[PDB]
Design a binder for this molecule. Structure first.
Ligand SMILES: Nc1ncnc2c1ncn2[C@@H]1O[C@H](COP(=O)(O)OP(=O)(O)O)[C@@H](O)[C@H]1O
Ligand SMILES: [Mg+2]
Lengths: 506, 51, 57
């Protein structure tokens, strides 16, 4: 094992060189270290939110620079640090390693490898706090992000550079729909067209290590870990790490965005980041705002999310897609953090336990789930083609407005109720089963013609699988036509109608 | 076999870390508190020569 | 090449190379399927004779 030997020799030689040329005099001395934060006197030249190295080895970061003393949030436990310990300022604002070598690796908030797969190969270092792109460098979101689930694609499409919030209650499928979005990209990431490749960045802030292991193994099984990036901020890890990990993952995604590549970063949880930052403020002597949350949780969320954008062709035509989460308390959408994040994201995806137990497996609440770019950021074959696919959302809202509670007026009302019930029956999708747009479009079309005569609602689950199999056999020409061309021609619509009639006849 | 070899590398790193305690104890009983002081003093002198 | 102290990759590769002809195709059916076809041909020809004579009638 010559590798540990030469890496130890190189690191120790660098330490010797640093010792030979350090001349650190204004370095600080710790006065009072609290619960994961320390107040240090000195560092008269410290930059704000600049990384520091304590004598015990725990890294720090400077939020509040009071006159004389500065508050250092510790990126780890306060076991090792004691009063009077030397602190070494790194001289640079906190940053995270970025590049293409981060793919296939799991890293902490600071970007250090935690998967035990060796050192991280980074093309460069990007600041954890990076200003979002301006008005001009961005571009209107037009390229869709293929989530692979029928309900979300049809009703709340996500596009490259869009910020769609997966807002929901506890264990209502938030990380689940995040995972289906994550996995569906394997269809294009296994190809060669980088313009369609969509590299993935998961932010596991506040999740437990067992959940992160579940995540990484699940991505490993479905050939997805190679193009995905796991930034894990464990709850046991220090609260500053939880606060910073989404920002560092945002920088990692911005690396792809600025290099002409498209990145999907799922800010899963981010309410745990919110409460971790609340902890940071409430021990940093900062007075809180509402429900003891600090003043800049709105500014924090907005500044973090705005880094996700669709860059213009002049900037490389790259994109960075955000998929934040909000864990509501008892379905309380009308709460400070939820409505705050909804006002940031370009639409939200609502999931409640009500639809989860009612049968809707994606738990897509079509009412409060709205996307800010309906026609754009959607597959042309799925957007309007036959018209009904466009006012699909309005039809769902009507079905909700005249559901079984409303009086069954007449045969038209009965037909509308049947159409709505069959449509919500269709939208249910099994977990870890990303269903492609070339297969989504025939099913959505079948939800407008041939939907009403379905033999029992429960049988539509197997009817969908049989219809996929039917489209696979001597109809793969239609599937590849709608996959490649994107738009649907009149002859294509006629062929799809004929196939639907032939299948519903059987 | 691949992840067995990966675990073998992890185990050899862990055994090196285990031997690190004996390495530390080697200099703990070594009367090192005189040569190290002189070396760090001359290193400080060299450091301040530039400054 | 990623594996350094394999001592077994050569063995499994040699086993796979020796077992490349895993098995030949099973083209056993050459008369019973022909029997089914001759029965089907007889049924079809008698059927169409009956149909043609019935429409002409
Ligand atoms: N297709 C599906 N969509 C959503 N949830 C599903 C699906 N199939 C099963 N589930 C169950 O729903 C739960 C989703 O909760 P999850 O997304 O883990 O929320 P959280 O991460 O906030 O606990 C999972 O525990 C899973 O067992
Ligand atoms: Mg989750």
């Amino acid at each position: 094992k010559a590798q540990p030997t030469e890496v130890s020799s190189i690191l120790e030689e660098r330490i010797k060189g640093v010792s030979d040329e350090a001349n650190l005099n204004e370095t600080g001395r710790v006065l009072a270290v609290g619960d994961g934060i320390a107040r240090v006197f000195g560092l008269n030249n410290i930059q704000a939110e600049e990384l520091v190295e304590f004598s015990s080895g725990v890294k720090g970061m400077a939020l509040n620079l009071e006159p004389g003393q500065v508050g250092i949030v510790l990126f780890g436990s306060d076991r090792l640090v004691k009063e009077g310990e030397l602190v070494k300022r790194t001289g640079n604002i906190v940053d995270v390693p970025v590049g293409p070598g981060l793919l296939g690796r799991v890293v902490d908030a600071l970007g250090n490898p935690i998967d035990g797969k060796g050192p991280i190969d980074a093309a460069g270092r990007s600041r954890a706090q990076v200003k979002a792109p301006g008005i001009l460098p961005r571009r209107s979101v037009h390229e869709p992000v293929q989530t692979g689930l029928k309900a979300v694609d049809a009703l709340v499409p996500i596009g490259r550079g869009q910020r769609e919030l997966i807002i929901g209650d506890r264990q209502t499928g938030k990380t689940a729909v995040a995972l289906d979005t994550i996995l569906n990209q394997k269809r294009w990431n296994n190809g060669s067209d980088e313009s369609k490749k969509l590299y993935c960045v998961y932010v596991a802030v506040g999740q437990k290590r067992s959940t992160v292991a579940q995540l990484v193994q699940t991505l490993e099984q479905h050939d997805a870990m190679k193009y995905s990036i796991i930034v894990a901020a464990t709850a046991s890890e220090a609260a500053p790490l939880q606060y910073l990990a989404p920002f560092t993952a945002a920088s990692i995604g911005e690396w792809f965005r600025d290099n002409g590549k498209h990145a999907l970063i799922v800010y899963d949880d981010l309410s745990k980041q919110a409460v971790a930052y609340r902890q940071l403020s409430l021990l940093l002597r900062r007075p809180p705002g509402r429900e003891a949350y600090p003043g800049d949780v709105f500014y924090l969320h907005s500044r973090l999310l705005e880094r996700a954008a669709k860059l213009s062709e002049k900037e490389g035509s790259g994109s960075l897609t955000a998929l934040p989460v909000i864990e509501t308390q008892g379905g309380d959408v009308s709460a400070y953090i939820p409505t705050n994040v909804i006002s940031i994201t370009d639409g939200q995806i609502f999931l409640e336990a009500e639809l989860f137990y009612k049968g809707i497996r994606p738990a897509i609440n079509v009412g409060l789930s709205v996307s800010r770019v309906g026609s754009a950021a959607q597959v042309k074959a799925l957007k309007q083609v036959a018209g009904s696919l466009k006012l699909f959302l309005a039809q769902y809202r009507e079905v909700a407005a005249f559901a079984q509670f409303g009086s069954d007026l007449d045969a038209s009302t009965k037909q509308t109720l049947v159409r709505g019930e069959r449509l919500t029956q269709l939208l249910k999708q099994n977990q870890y089963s990303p269903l492609a747009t070339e297969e989504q479009v025939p099913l959505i079309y079948a939800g407008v013609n041939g939907h009403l005569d379905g033999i029992e609602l429960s049988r539509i689950g197997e009817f969908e699988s049989s219809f996929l199999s039917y489209l696979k056999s001597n109809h793969n020409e239609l599937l590849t036509e709608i996959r490649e061309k994107g738009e649907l021609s009149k002859e294509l619509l006629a062929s799809l109608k004929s196939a639907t009639e032939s299948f519903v006849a059987t | 076999w691949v992840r067995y070899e990966a675990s073998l590398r992890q185990l050899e790193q862990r055994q090196l870390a285990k031997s690190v305690i004996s390495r530390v104890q080697s200099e703990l009983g070594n009367p090192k508190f005189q040569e190290k002081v002189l070396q760090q003093s001359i290193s400080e002198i060299e450091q301040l020569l530039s400054k | 090449s990623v594996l350094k102290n394999t001592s077994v990759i050569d063995k499994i590769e040699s086993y796979v190379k020796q077992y490349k002809p895993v098995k030949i195709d099973a083209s056993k059916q050459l008369q019973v399927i022909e029997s089914f076809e001759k029965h089907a041909m007889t049924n079809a020809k008698e059927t169409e004779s009956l149909v043609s004579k019935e429409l002409k009638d």
